[PDB]
């Protein structure tokens, strides 16, 4: 009798998720029986991963290709996921740099992609988990949330202020059976990372080999995380199990963020 | 294919796991195919409890009927369980009071219970579990740790105490296959809850459901918690599925701690 | 007899943001009376003048004064213009009104954005690169307890002073040691005209007394009390100081003890 | 010509621990520029007086000392002889030496929650109800930056200093509408005698200079230096001050940067 996770059948509405963390959350969500619309903006890497999950699983798997930053972009993919059960959000930072060289409308971006899509599309869903008695949202932050990250102003500020929001909004809903949880991820070995990491390496004129040891050694785990791992954890926060857990803000870093809380 | 939390057949040391939250856990983990030792002071309790949770599932189930805050008595469970893969620490807190009121040996008898037991018994069984390259430890607190009560300062004290400590060592042994992690509940219905509110009811002229509805209007949930959903977040954690996930406080407690973080 | 405090920061300027009244005008009123001179900054004219008059007579450091709205480009530039390169500069602004999410548009987020996170974010950039040439700067977001403890009716200072703080912890550790230093004061309830006025259209809004309606905030205080814009503005004048240079990307709490949190 | 922040506690008297040197000192000498009169406590008599006499020639307070071990009901007895209604009391201790717990005895543990918690919580509680019938009282607990960010060889200051956080948390509330406050000092690395001689030992037990390891703990530090007593004692002075009575359970961290953490 292995842990029924109770969600069988529902609904899950998936943001970035051809590939990395999002695409580890959809395989997670669908092994428990989550029928999926899952969200990237290229068609051909989304229909590959819709395909393997679908095959693997024994759930329905559509896709919506669209920019979900804008307007119709965000309408498109509400338009195939009108009534999620679960809705997980997740997008890609803006480079780093330094604040002294960023525009007014790079803060503007920044702040769409990260923090008000995300607070759009909760306001598109919330009332229909609300009716049902149940919801899930797990929002898809970074440990720099804890420790912001010199060179990561713009993202820095987009999610600590998603994640302020969240923590008002969560307490208001968690009584009608709608949960609201951020998961913090530190360094996961994903495609992205390691393309990220083969270009700093031939930078630096460090081997790739020699720069992963490098971001290893400030990991107390002394591994990187993988989306398998995180996935899980976005399973269990969708649970029947976890209605008494709410605003809560997860780190997944291997220990490597060396506060108390 | 439900989630395989992959502990099956592990040994399991649970403390103060006749009744509430430490039952919770137990029969959570046995639901898993863990194998058990349990502790609590009381054997009837005790033997009831084990033979509840051997027919339910398909695990041994040894019990220990001992003081663990003695050094005698946490030999005792030690010798019942000397190689365990998972540590679940837990106890009782002192009644609650006015500091200037409790004595000296009122401070130490409450930081024995409630912070250096838990420290001697993983100083006990960690360096087994680095050496299997395996091991978790949950220590059950709670979510005063986060905002602590006016009248519970010996266990505000030694419980703060104890997550300063774990804080420390859960970076130095996750590198090795150990996860150290604190579960801080809020207000959960066990029988020691509803037989204090039993108390404070009749106190306070009030009905035993007038005086539940007053604590409930405090927790955004709407509810208390239950043991069982308590037990499924303890067993996640104790899973091959959370060994990137390590000090961290995870807070239980329907929304009801207003802090962002 | 006694020694008694020297902040040791006469004869340099500070930029205070929205210093007509409230908790920018005690920041104002601390650093004058350490001699700080100042430029003080609010979007009516009358006021603001009204205020500067006042504070001339009350210390000997000069105060200046630019009627403009910060949250545009053209606002921004009439500050800068007045006070090209301020050694202090106190970010301050009136919070958006409080309502339910689901019924703001998306110009309300891009308002309360601009207001309570970016313009600060602009007046940091065009200020700190002086500040780091000179060897010295200051910088004193006042956001809000609310940081600490968000409440679901004010989702957008809630998400938009959330936003600046998290840049901050950033920031703050690239410049400390040029001598910069950026921290967030955090005000509970405070006793300015804006909170009673708001507090009375409660008042007359749920039918109480406005003394029922203030005891009944005061019961949430664990202090008793309302803070003060002058212990306010002595805590923003200590930040300010030459004995606060190890000190940054601090969030300190001025509320009383109201929010429970240990940290 | 500018007036100078007065902290208004002229007159009051202050209890401070472990105050022959260090932060200790630093916090004496704050206090007794603001014209508090001061009882000093440490365990050595001859740097204890000579401390004293140094005060004494520097301001205008009275000075007393008590040569005592507060960790003992009988140091405690006879530092409260000499003091029985402190306005002012500075919690201070140094912690036990680093090491790895699996090699700590039991008494390792209880000789450390006493020197770090118990004694502190034992002193408040036998000064706070005469500061309450006075409507004052501050106490300032120095501890550490590690209660933010704990390392494993400092496993018993950790666990104790993390303790008395937690406790001071829960007071705090509860006696700040009768004029208490409550609030805790972590320093990061200071330049006191103590640094300085626990440094050269590292550095003649690693083989490197003592410039060389200087530099390398330097290096972790983004203010690019390390604190001094005296700005430490400045922040203890103004948390004492009648300008910081709307702050309590406060964990004000003088580390020049060097805990990452956004809060």
């Given at each position: 009798h292995?842990?029924?996770l109770?969600?069988?059948g529902?609904?899950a509405?998936?943001?970035?998720a051809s ?15 989550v ?11 989304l ?14 798997v ?5 920019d ?14 009108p009534?999620?059960?679960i ?12 604040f ?10 920044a ?5 008000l ?5 909760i ?6 988990m ?9 929002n ?63 930078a ?10 490098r ?15 995180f ?10 199990h976890?209605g008494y857990?709410?605003?809560?803000n ?10 108390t809380?």
């Amino acid at each position: 009798h292995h842990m029924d996770l109770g969600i069988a059948g529902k609904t899950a509405l998936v943001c970035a998720a051809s590939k990395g963390l999002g695409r580890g959350c959809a395989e997670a969500l669908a092994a428990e029986g989550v029928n999926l619309v899952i969200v990237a903006r290229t068609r051909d890497t989304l229909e590959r991963t819709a395909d393997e999950i679908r095959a693997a699983s024994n759930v329905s798997v559509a896709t919506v290709a669209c920019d979900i930053t804008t307007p119709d972009g965000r309408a498109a993919a509400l338009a195939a996921c009108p009534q999620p059960d679960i809705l997980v959000n997740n997008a890609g930072g803006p480079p780093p740099g330094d604040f002294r060289d960023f525009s007014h409308d790079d803060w503007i971006r920044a702040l769409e992609s990260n923090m008000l899509t995300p607070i759009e599309l909760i306001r598109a869903t919330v009332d229909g988990m609300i009716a049902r008695g149940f919801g899930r949202i797990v929002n898809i932050t970074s440990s720099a949330v804890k420790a912001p990250i010199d060179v990561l102003a713009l993202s820095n500020g987009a999610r600590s202020g998603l994640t302020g929001f969240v923590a008002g909004l969560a307490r208001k809903v968690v009584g009608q059976g709608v949960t609201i949880n951020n998961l913090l991820p530190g360094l996961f070995d994903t495609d992205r990372i390691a393309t990220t990491l083969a270009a700093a390496a031939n930078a630096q004129g460090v081997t790739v080999d020699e720069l992963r040891a490098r971001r290893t050694r400030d990991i107390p785990a002394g591994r990187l995380g993988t989306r398998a791992e995180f996935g899980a954890a976005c399973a269990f926060l969708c649970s029947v199990h976890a209605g008494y857990i709410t605003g809560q803000n997860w780190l997944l870093d291997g220990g490597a963020y060396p506060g108390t809380f």
